[PDB]
Structure formats: structure tokens, C-alpha cells
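Recap quiz, item 2
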Amino acid sequence: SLYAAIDLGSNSFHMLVVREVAGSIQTLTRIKRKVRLAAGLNSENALSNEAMERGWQCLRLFAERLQDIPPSQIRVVATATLRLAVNAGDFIAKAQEILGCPVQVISGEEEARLIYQGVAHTTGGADQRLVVDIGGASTELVTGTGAQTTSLFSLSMGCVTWLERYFALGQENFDAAEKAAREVLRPVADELRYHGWKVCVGASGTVQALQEIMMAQGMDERITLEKLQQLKQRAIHCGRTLERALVFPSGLAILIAIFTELNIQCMTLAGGALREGLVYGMLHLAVEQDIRSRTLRNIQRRFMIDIDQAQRVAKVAANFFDQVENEWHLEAISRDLLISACQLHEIGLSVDFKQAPQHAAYLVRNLDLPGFTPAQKKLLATLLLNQTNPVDLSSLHQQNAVPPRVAEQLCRLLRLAIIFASRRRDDLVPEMTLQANHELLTLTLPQGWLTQHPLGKEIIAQESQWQSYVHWPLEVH
Amino acid sequence: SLYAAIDLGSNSFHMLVVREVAGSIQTLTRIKRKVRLAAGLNSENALSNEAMERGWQCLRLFAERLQDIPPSQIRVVATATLRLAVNAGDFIAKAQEILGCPVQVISGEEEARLIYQGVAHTTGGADQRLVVDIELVTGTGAQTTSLFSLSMGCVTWLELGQENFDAAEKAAREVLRPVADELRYHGWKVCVGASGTVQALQEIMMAQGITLEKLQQLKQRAIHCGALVFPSGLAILIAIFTELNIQCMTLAGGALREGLVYGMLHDIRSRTLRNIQRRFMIDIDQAQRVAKVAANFFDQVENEWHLEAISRDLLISACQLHEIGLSVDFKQAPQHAAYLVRNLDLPGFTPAQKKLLATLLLNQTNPVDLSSLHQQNAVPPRVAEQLCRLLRLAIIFASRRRDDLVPEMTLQANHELLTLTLPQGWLTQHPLGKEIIAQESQWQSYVHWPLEVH
Amino acid sequence: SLYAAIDLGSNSFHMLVVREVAGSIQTLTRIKRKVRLAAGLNSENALSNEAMERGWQCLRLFAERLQDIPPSQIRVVATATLRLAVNAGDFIAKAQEILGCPVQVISGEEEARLIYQGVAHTTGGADQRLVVDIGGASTELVTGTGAQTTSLFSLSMGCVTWLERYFADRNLGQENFDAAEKAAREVLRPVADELRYHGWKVCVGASGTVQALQEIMMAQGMDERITLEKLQQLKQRAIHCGRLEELEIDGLTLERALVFPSGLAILIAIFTELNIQCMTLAGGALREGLVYGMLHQDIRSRTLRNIQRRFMIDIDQAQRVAKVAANFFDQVENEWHLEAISRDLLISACQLHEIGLSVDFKQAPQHAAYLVRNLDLPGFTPAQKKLLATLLLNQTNPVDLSSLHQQNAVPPRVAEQLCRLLRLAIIFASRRRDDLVPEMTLQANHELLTLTLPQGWLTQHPLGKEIIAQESQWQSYVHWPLEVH
Amino acid sequence: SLYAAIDLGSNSFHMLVVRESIQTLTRIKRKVRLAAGLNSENALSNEAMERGWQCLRLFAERLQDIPPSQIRVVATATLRLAVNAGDFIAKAQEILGCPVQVISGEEEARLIYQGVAHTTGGADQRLVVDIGGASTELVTGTGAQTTSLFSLSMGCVTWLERYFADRNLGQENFDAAEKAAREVLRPVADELRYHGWKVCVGASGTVQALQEIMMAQGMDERITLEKLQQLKQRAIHCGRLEELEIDGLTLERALVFPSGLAILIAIFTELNIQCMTLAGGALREGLVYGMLHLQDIRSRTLRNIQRRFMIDIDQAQRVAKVAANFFDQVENEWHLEAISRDLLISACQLHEIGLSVDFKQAPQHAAYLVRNLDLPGFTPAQKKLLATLLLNQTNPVDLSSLHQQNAVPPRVAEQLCRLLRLAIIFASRRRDDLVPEMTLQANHELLTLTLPQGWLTQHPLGKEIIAQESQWQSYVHWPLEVH
Ligand SMILES: [Cl-]
Ligand SMILES: [Cl-]
Ligand SMILES: [Cl-]
Ligand SMILES: [Cl-]
Ligand SMILES: [Cl-]
Ligand SMILES: [Cl-]
Ligand SMILES: [Cl-]
Ligand SMILES: [Cl-]
């Protein structure tokens, strides 16, 4: 059965259809039609006939998409413009006759709660987080732990209104909007660093925008203060994406104000926003301790991945990681990437046994993996591509999620792990010592294990050979 | 659960591990190890001990790969070489302690029986069929009517100017001339080949872009030249062809080891199709919904377009899988769909047929790529287009996912013109539909498919 | 003007046509036609008029290709099969007049001498070398230094003869291998002392068996270095297949496979008797030998210079950048444990790094790689050629590790290090004047480079500063830490 | 040696550095904003004064080792106006080791015409349109002597302000600009139209947006007002300005694209312009060729390239000889006009370029070189077809690439390709005295070639190569008979 969320906003009407798969949800259609509803709104604070007719025609099309979707599974909501129209009930009234179902105007705060609920369902990392959505109407800031909102503030700052207001681009023109936006940030520095966060995550177009310029210029996806300073000092350089660009400097001035005010170290892009909030709310899902686990679990059902074999390889790889962790100085996100790889590593077998690593990497590049950044997906995919056969460093280093040396190391851990869990018995997995000395791995097998496992011996000899072609010394006794 | 078939042959030991998932089985490993058992015979019909050592060493590896498989789901068998050895009992004895389980020596007829069961459970096409292994068999629907072992084999004939070819050919036609009689009586709708040799030939068929025409024209790719076993196997078959008056040969999707697996288990196409839907969580009501529309469309245009019942079933198959790309992701679903179909093993469809499903699926929407429709051998180019059209339009009018919301339509074909008639007023009441149908119209026309809809 | 070389061989007639461009050679046509002349030999060693007909007909084509080239600039040679056939004098005379020129039967020794000349003009590395060429009927071993042979031998063993004696019954077992190797050691043994006396710094090989090895190793993902270990692994593989007709080795083509076991056996026997540590594939052979003699020390440098001439590369800029690169290498060669091979490859990159400019400035790295990838570069192996190309592809802009690492020639970490030196070296030659290159020190601390500039040099050059800053960013996106003040 | 050219604009400073025929080494644009130092009384402020100076010290570090004799600097736009400008120009002159001169807009337009005149192919009798962001230059001329010259007041940036005070491509704000610009050049209009031109070429941003839009959308390369208004209609249908998108348009382009789209179609109408190719040079190129003190471009290009890649020139003429003769014998039957004769000869002069890389896959190398080389006197479309002819000079034909070009119709790309293969083959002996006498006759898709009596029988390798060439053509349905 189908679920739908419609967001009637300022410039565009957004409709996201979606479908229930096992205990999951996948996008079916995701649609945006440019109504220009805030443009038809005059100095009497009412909305011109032309804009309400534009908006209504759009919804006549959306209405065609909702037929025999039970309205229990639909939620339509509206935002700033329809919040502040003196007209609004005239539009909403016909809107609800066109669609077969209610329109709910929502407070700027209920938009924030919804947005949070949307990143919370779609974002990996720590439960304690601080969400930043810089929109044109309101720039919300919310703190929370695992789907409970501790603080929730919808503050009135636009990328449009900090734009027109303070830009008719100086190094000091940001300066105005900066302190301007900092005045609103001045009271809540108290309560936002009160509850704090261990991870910071952005949600909307200006955030999305910055993500895409970093991607474009060759940086990773970590938004740091020093990277926005490449811009601000190059942002009086020009001095005065197409649509994104126009509204960019104000949003950028707001972000460079928020990083400095709150001493946010790092921001990365949420995988969720309002429309996901609405449609996850309708799912009635117990909220998970770790989102990535739900994702992996659902993919495993969908593609009938053998879970016991999956779990067995994760255990071996986790054990190997822990034993080389100090010598290789691996951090924890690498461990979760490695395990996540192991949970998915046989998905290529869904398609066919022969070229399964090719199939694995195809599926993982292209699957929607909530809880995983785009950069992390590619890393997982290329790890899966290199799970066996001659190492292909060319395709391995097609990732930017972890440092290259570390990509190689997680590759090595995954390849070995698959080999020593390969018998598909939880009692056939031997006791082993793994010791790393710089680029050397030494694996100590149970005495007599090799001479007693002639297929194991063959496979480890081959693996040693392959790692050596790529100058990874492997010694297994 | 996981099942294994092992075939102890003369030259090689073969293994097949298979997993039973949803409505069928999928291959896990398919392994061949060269033990050269036959080479260790001394003319006293005894096996060298070095040969026994090789075979036991190969089994030691197989046996490691088979732990967590229970003996009742394994079948190990042994072909002619261990049939003729006074030694055999000694090898088989250590082998059964190495493996977890018994080794069953089997007669050639029984091997031909099991082989045939293997082609039966894995091969699309009709029921009655004539199998050729360079051992020939006829049967209908998993029941072997006739059976054979003839006086030719792979290596046997070898020991290319037209002399040396027809030195094999007519001497092969000699071998099969007296036995070719009782065959035509039993009859065959479909002629198939199971041996690897046949696969020498299928690789060329879908490599250049099985008939006696292409056989002689291949035999003349040989004559003009002036691989170990190939020229023998060729001369036999094109002799097996003429003397049996056989129209065309396809390749079976199974052999001995498939026979052993299915014999342990409690329309091939239908099984595959539903198997795939299960595995990739395709919405089966929607697939059926699209198929009834497309088949209904098909029926209305098939008289004008001269369409074969065979084309009908390719079209319906395409509709059964058309949403498989969505199991990956919605954005570029047509391309994931072509990817999955291209790489799945699909029992009941030839390589040309699978290649045609893929491109039908890739072109189920968006700007049409005619070249893509064209690189495929299951159907003429024009037919691939005709069925692509029906599939794209069937998908549009079923996009609601509800049986009673798909409109009553009539479809008329005048050469390349399709004329779709919707219920009166339908277009008026469906603004998004209007929009989709105009965009499809625009797309069909970029590629010279003229489409009126009323 | 044109030069041409005909090799009338046992299985094939080979032609090479060639042109003197700049100060080196450029190949125009390279032609092999199978006449299978030895196939028309008989038990009495006379050539079937069938075979002899195929031969003349080929030479009739070689002839038309040959017209309007002076006989001064042509050499036609016949080898083992035509020095066998009693019949042979008859094929020559007609062939000699089907072509416009003489057909010279050569001894196995003159065959050896031209082979060594072929390799010495095309092969980089230590110029004091051992050359092995295992042919059908004979095996040349020549010992030499930089075009001067110090010892030379043509011995009666070869893949075709050895397949017949020791692989009598078509079995690939340890029995027949042991015999084949034992006989070859006994052929070779008497000349071993003279070969070791003159010694060699590098062993390089030449014919089908060596080529089969390059193609096998390439296919299986190994480097291009032939070692005893790899030969033993192939041998155990051959023994596993057990019958010549069942030989299957990944990388081993059909027509190499027929003569592969016997050659493999001879080469292992050669590898053992002389204790060869490593054998690589020579740049050239008999037909190169024929050509370089009609033309009348460091192969790499001749190649680099000739390419610079052909593509109008600025040679002063090239040397400038190479000097900066070579000196960066030395300051860091310690901490990064870098060998002499790397230094040469780094410098060679520097000599060619600007060759993409000869196409156009916008995409010049992309063009440089295309040119280097596809150019013939005598003195460089295909693995080295591909490395150079990829250092050039990455000489500027955001580092692309994916393209950097499709390279087999150095170890992966060394490919990066060399790349980093090439990028910096280029940056500090950017103004194209030897006087304008600062005094610098570069210390390497594991993955981090520290570069110290003359006092306030950064403050004085707002461009150099700007670029350097960009290069430290580029390096940082790949996690190469670079400090410059 | 190396030459430099610096252009001091109100918006940006522009460098062009070149090695000597000549080739670009660096092409630089720095952002200055000298228009924002000009106040109400029209003197230049000391904020931007330092900015352009800070920019000039970067250009300065680049231009050492270039003697000032081989440098040329000019200042335009904002620098004329400002009464303060002399102050700037003075310290700028100290920063660079060389003089800066202030040039007018009409001298600006002469150096512009000089730029296209030395670089651009096609009829030496031309109309040049260049739309700055503020000033629009239009110049009639015949072959490096200019018949007429104009610099008007309209530009992308200006028309984005005055006649575009929002983001609505609705015809009301659009056609006010298509008028107020059309009346701007309506006074000068008549003197251009009677001076006349055989060809119209353009050189500003607006014109590069169209060349790019056209190669991306697969159209042929002549810009028409009909083509201009498929983009007007896929502009108009785009509602607001920020929402604008078409195939082949880029970041900085669409920024001011619509305001220039109006100006070009206004120039297209009032002047009644039939089509437009993209000019090969401009102001900075003018400056550069003024320092070189140097007949027809293409032949100058072909020589230069043949020298860089050491192409055997004799063999190149020898092949172009045969292909010329083959062209003339099929010329009437096949609808072959001189434009596409030159293209055949140009392909021949270069046909051996890939051999400068390596002989094995030379055709593939020749296409790569020609595809990426800068070839003054050939449009992008013509270059692209030259590449594919060279790719297909031998070896099984590939039609897709032969039909991948904007230059000459998919039909003729083949007929040309056919004649090149034939000319190469019979020139293949590298000697004048060995080319055989030949007749070549076409009838629809049949070529029939008569070699001397007994030639074939007595050229087995020829006979073999010819046979293989008959098969390759037939594969692609090109019937060929030869006797
Ligand atoms: Cl794979
Ligand atoms: Cl990486
Ligand atoms: Cl077997
Ligand atoms: Cl029948
Ligand atoms: Cl030595
Ligand atoms: Cl290796
Ligand atoms: Cl050595
Ligand atoms: Cl003038």
C-alpha cells in the first residue's frame, strides 16, 4: 500500500509518494511543481487570484495521483505563505475540494518538529544531534536525542530575507546579516549549547547547495568553518546552481554565522526533511537505537540475503579490526563502515553467483541507504567490488569517505574476514591472532589448521598472492 | 536450504551447489576440478594409485566445501570410468569416508535418464523434445519416452579440407543412419543440445550477431582455415542434423547435475517469472494488471501487425518483470531493470530472449532508444518496437494500481499508426493523464511511432 | 627515407618497414604472413612445391610493398628452415628475383648477433646484459655491454625439437619435464662458465616463450618480471593439466600453448643453470637488429630527446623541471626509501611532462597521458610507459588516485610519492628561468612533506604563493600533508 | 618568443599569453570591479584602485621574462570616464614594466575586428558582432581592412538592469529591450546593411552560449533567428529568470544570457542577418597580432600543424591531389559544392597526423589530435567532421561517428569519407611516378573506378587492399566496382 505527503510551500508544491516494502519504505514518485504562491501576495497581505488559480491547477494534477490512496495514508500541510495569508481559508477551502482530503496549516514549530522527525529517521551517527534548516521563510534550529526534541526553535531568518534586507556582496555585508542573524542566535546560544549535540546536520537548499559545491571542487562532504572561509573571502571576490546561487550569499552568511556562534565543528547533510517527517510519522515505526541497523536489516529482507552468513563475517571482521585498531589508529566510523560492508557483502548473490561483486557494487551504488551518506555508499560499493579476485586499486580509490590508506585497510579486513568465515558454520570459524606491523599483517592460525583445511589453505595462499601484487604483505601461519 | 550434486567423471570431478529460495533454486557454486581418473587405467581395468590419490585429493577439497550441507541433500554419482574398474570399490570406499556420504555408481542409461531430467526442469519451449549430447533422448514433460547411447563421442571421431570433414560426416551419417528411424516416429517439437560441445556453437550464434545453414557456413569458416575437440563435434552434429532432418537446435539449461538436484526436490517460464517476482518483491497484482492490459492491447493489434503467439508471451513476461528495477530504486528504475534482467539467470528464456526483455524494460518509458531495441535476436527489429509500444502504453494506463481504475479502451493499428480510444470524457477528467499521454505521444513520434489518442 | 627488413622464418614471413624521423626510427608497417614453410618440409628435408608456392606468393606481395625503396636500405634474411632444406637453393633463386634483392641465409650465430643488436638499441636498464632467445630449433645466449658482445652462442635446443624428444607421448607430467630440463642443462652447461665469466647486470629475453610469459603474467595480474618461482608455478599448472591437448593457463593463447611446455622447460633449465634472478622482455629482436645496422649509449635518453624534438617540447624547461624534481627526490630519498629506478622514472616524466601542450593548453595533462600512452618509447617497458603517462595525467589539478593507480611499474605508495615530487617540481619551475627557482629544502616525515622557502619568498610572490596554497589544498583532499613557509 | 596582451575592463582584467604561427599557453581572467569605484562625480575611488593594482602585481609576476616590446596593454570602459583614472594608470604602469594606453571604443572595435580577421575562416567580407556587458561593437570589413565600424550603448549587464528590473521573460519586459536596443542601433543600421557582408561572425559571451547550445542540442552550427527563437520560446516558457534552462548553456552564461539574447535578435532583425558562426579571435587577439607584423588562414593553419607533427608534406599533397581529382569526376553527379571540396583537401593534408603518434592505430590518433587541436580557420563543426573523416580513413567504417557532426550533412560526410579512403590507397607508394591513371564515376550510391589495363593483375597487394576496401564499403552499403 501507498503513502503520500504534500507540502504546499512558498514557491513550490511538493508531493512525495512512497510504498511500504516489508518493514520499510521506498520512494515511488517525488514531484515538485513551481506554483509561485508567495509571488501572488500583495501589501494587503492577501493572495492574487492568479496565484490561487496556479496553485489550484497544480493540485488538480496531484489529486489525480491520490485516487484510492486511503486518506489515512495521506498528509497535506502548508507553511509560511498560507500561514500568513489573510486569504488562506479561501485557498485551503477549494484545495480540500480538489484533493479529496484535509489541508493542515502548521505552525513554524510543527514544521520544525516534522523536519527533525525526518532527519531522525534518515540520518546515521549519534542520537544527540543539532539540526539546521536554513529556509527562505524561517531558519529552524532543533536539538534532540533519538527522536525526542529537547529544544525546538523556529527563528525568522531567510536566505531571501537576510538577502533583500541586507543585500541590495561585501566582506562586511555578510557582517550585517551575520550579527543580524546572530542577534536571534544571541538568546539561544544559552539553550542550544545547553543540551548540546555530538553531531550537527543541515537540512535544506543552502545546506544542499554547499554540499554540491564541495563535491564539485574536490573536497569531502564534511562542512567545516575553514571551508566556508574559502568562500566568504572569495565571496566579496565576485562582489554583487542557477536558482540556488541567487539566494546563496545570505544563506551562506547565516551558516558562517551559525558555525561561529555555536562553535559547530562539522556539519553534514541530513538525509531527511519535512516530507520524510510526514511520511515516516504515518509509518508508525518504533524509533530505532541505530538507523543504519534498520536499513541493513530491511535490505537483507528485500534481497533475501543470508543473515547467518552475513552476521558471521561481521564478527570475524570486527574481531580483526579490534586487533589492528591501535597499530592502524582506526576510528569508530571505519568500524561501522566495515561491519556495514559485511552485512551487505553477499547482496550481489541476489543477482547471480558468477560476477556477484560486480552486482553487489551495482546494487549498493544505486540503492537508497538511509543512514549512509552518498560518499559512504560509494565506499561500501567499492569495498564490495573488491571483496575477492585481484585487488583493483583504481576502483578502490574511487571513494572519498575515508582516507585512502584506511580504504585499503578496511578492504584487507573484509577480504580476510570473508575467507575465514567462509565455511558457513559458526562452529567451523577458527581462533586466530591478527597483528599489524605497519603494512604487514601476520595471521596466526590454530596449529595444524592449514594442513587440516586444504581448501582453506588454497584460498589463503591465493589471497596472499593477490595482496602481494598490490604490495600488501600477508603472512599466515 | 543448500543442496549439492557431485559427478565423478573420467577427466574431471564436477560439483554444483544450489540454494532453494522462494519457488525454486539458484546456483551458488559450479566447480570443475581435473583429476584425470581415466588416464590412470592400465589395460587390466585397474586405476593407478596416483590417480586414486588425485581423486581423493579433489574430494578432500569438495568435502570441505560441503560441511553444513547434510548428506541427505547431497548426491554423489560416478560415471563409466568407475563403472569399469575392478579397483572402483577401493576408490569409492575411501571417497565415501572423505565425503560425508555414499557414492552411487550409475549406468549410462540412468545417466541419460538423470541428464534428461536435468534438461526437463530447466528448459523453456514445448513439452516434447529431442536432446543431443556429443546420448540422444526424446520425452514430454519430465517423462523420458526414448533414450540412447550411439557409437560416436567427442575425442572418438577426431582420430580440414573437404575430404577430412566428410571423412567424419558420412562416416558419422553411417553410424546414425540405421538408428534414425525409430526417432522420427517418436517425434519432436523442440530440438535441444546439452553437451558442452553445443555450447561451442551457441557462443558463436550470439557472438557474430543452430541451423545447417550457419553450420556449413561455419564449417566453411573451418574449411577456409586450412578447439581441442571442436572439428570432430562439428562434423558429427551437422551429420546428426541432416540425417535427422532437424530444423534448429537450442541449448538446454541443465544436465546431469541439475537432474540430481531436482530429483531431490519435492511451464518453466511461469516458474522463473514468479520466482523472480518473489525474490525482488515485485508487486504481483500490478504486474498482472499491466499484463492483462498489454495482452488486451496485443489482441487488438495482432491481426493488423501479424504477431505470433510467441511474441505475446515475451510481451507478457516483460510486463511481469517491468517493475523489477524499482526494487533497486525509483529514479532510474528502467536502467536498473535492464541491469537485473541482463544478469539474472532466467530458466525458460534464451540469451536472445533475455537480452530482449532487458531492452524492452530499459525502454519502458523516457526517450526511445531504437538501437537498443535492435541489438537482440529473439525477434525482428520491427517486432521489438511493436511490443515496446504496447508495454509503454500498458504501463501508463495501469499507473493507478487498481483494477477498476484502468479505463476501457480500444486500440487500432493502421501500419505504424496506433489509435487509442479512451472512454468519452476520460481525458477531460484526467489532467495528469492528459499530460502523461501527450509526453508519451511526443516520445513515440521522435522515433516515428505515430500515435493518436481520443 | 625508408628502410625495410624481411625475416623468412619457419612458420612466418615477417616484414618491417621503417622511417628515419628526427634522430631515431619510426615504424610504418609491421607485417607477418604465415606461409608455414617448415610445414612443407619432408622426411628427406625438401620443400613441398605447395610450401614453396605459398612462400613465393607472399614475397610477391612483400615485393610490391618494396618497390621504390633502394636495395641499399633493404635486408632480407632466411633462418633455420631454409638452412635445412636440401631443396632450399631453389626457393631462394626465384624468391631472390620475385623481390629485387638478395636473400641471405644466416647462421644461428649471425642470427644471434642481430638479435643482440636488436635488443641493445631498444632496451633500457643496465647496459651489461644477458640475452636469451629460445627459438624453434635453437636457443641463442649472448652476453654483452651496450652494443658490444662479449660472448655469443647458438645451441641446438628449442621448443619444437624439445617437444618432440621429451614430450614424446604428449604427457605434461613431472616425468617428461624432468627429462626436458635435464637435457637443456646438458646443452647449456659447457658454455655456462664463459657466460658467467663475462657476467651480466640484467637478463632480458626475446622470443615466443618469453612473450607467452609476458602475456600470461599480464593476464593473471602479476608484474612483468619473470622469476623462477613464477615459472615453477606455471610448471605445476602444466603438470596438473597432464596432457598437452588439455593445457589451459590463464593468459596462454592457442598457438603459444602448442610449444609452451617445452619452452617453459628450457627456460627453467636456463634459469637454474645460470642462476637468473629476473628476466624481462627485450625491446627488440632480429628484425630491429637488421634495421639498426642499415642506419649506421643511454637508450632512454635518446628516446626522450627524440620525442622532445618530434613534439617541439621546450627542452630547457624540461631540464629545469627535472633538476628541481631530481633534487627533491634526494632530500626525501632517505625517509621514503626510494630506489634508482624511481629516480629515472621521475626524471623521465619531467622530460616529457609538457608534451600535452603540443596539442592544446586547456586539457594538456589529459593530452600528455594520451600521447605517452600510445607513443612507442624504446627503453621503457609497457608497465613503465603506463606509469609515466599517469604521472603526467596527474601533474596538476585535483589529484585523481583512481587514475594514478592503474599502474604496475612502481609500488602503489611510490607512485604517489613520485607524483607529489613531479607536481612540486613543476610548480617551482613555473616562471621558466633557471635564476628564478628558489633555494629550497624538503624534508619528508612519513606522509608529510615540509618545504622551507627563502625568507619571505611567499610574501614577495603573490602568484607563487597563490598556486602553492592551491597545491597544498589539492594534496590535502587526498590526505597528503604538505607544509610550506 | 612569448607575447602577452592585457585588457583592463570595468569588470575584469584579462591576460592572454602565447608562444610563437602562435599557440595559447595561459588564458586568465581576474575579477576587479573597477566600475564600483566610480562615484557620482565620476572619479575613481582608492578602494578599487588598490584592487586592480593587487591584480596587476599577479599579472606582473607572470609576465617577467617577456620583454615589453612583446607586451601590449590597453585600458577601456571605466578607465576612460574616471577623471581620477590617470592616477591609477600611472601606478599600474609602475607595477608592470611597460606602458598602459587608454584606447577608445572605436579603437577597441578595430582591434576586435583585427582579431577575427587573422583567426577566422570564411569569406574575408564579413560583419562582426561583439556584445560586451555595457558596450556593443558592430564592424563591417573586407579582409583585415575595415569598411565600417561602430560601438553602441547596449550590453548584457546594462540590459539586465534597465530593461530587466525583475526575473520575468514575459514578452513585456523582453521586447522593451528588443526595442530599446533595436532603436539604439537603428541610426547606424543603414550604413552597415549597404556596406554589406558575405558572412556574419560573433565574438562575445552571447555568441559562445549559442555555439555551445548548438553543439549540445545536435543542431547544425549556423545560428538563425529561427534557431534564436526556439530559445526564445524555451526561454519564454521558463517563467521567471532564475528558473531558466536549455541544453548547452552554462553558469556564467545564463547569468546575463537573456539581455543579450534580445540584443542579438534585435541585431538579427534590423540588420536582416542570415546566420552566424562563432569568430576565432577578439580584442586580445588583435593586440597580439599587432605585434607579430605578419594569406588565407586555413592554409596557414595546415602548414603550421604539418610542421609541429612533422607530417610528410609531399605525401599530403599527393593524397590531396588524387582526392581532388576524384572529387571532380563525381562532382556533378553527387551535388558537391566547393565548401565540401575544401573540407576534403583539408582532411587530406592532415590525414597522416596520427602516424606522428604511432602507426598501429594511427587513425584513432589522428582523430584525437584533430579533435583537440586548435585549428584557426575551421569552426567546431568542421573540425569535428575532419576528425571523423580521419578516423574512418581506412578500417571498417563507423557511420555513427560519420553522422556525429554539425558541419556538413550526414549524406556528404560519407561521400567525402569515401573519396579519402580511395585517394590514400592509390597514393600509398609515396611517389608521384607511381600513381595510376584513373576514372571514377558515380550513379546514386555506386562508385565505379577504372584502373589501367593489367594494373590489378600485376599489383597483388593493391588487388588485396582494394578487395578489402570493397568489402568494408559494402558492409556499410557503399557499392564499389574497380577494373
Ligand atoms: Cl566480479
Ligand atoms: Cl580513496
Ligand atoms: Cl569428465
Ligand atoms: Cl519431426
Ligand atoms: Cl652474474
Ligand atoms: Cl608479480
Ligand atoms: Cl640475473
Ligand atoms: Cl583597419
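Residues A 469; C 222-223 surround chloride ion (ligand 6) (CB under 6 Å).
Chain A touches chain C through 19 residues (CB under 8 Å).
End of item.
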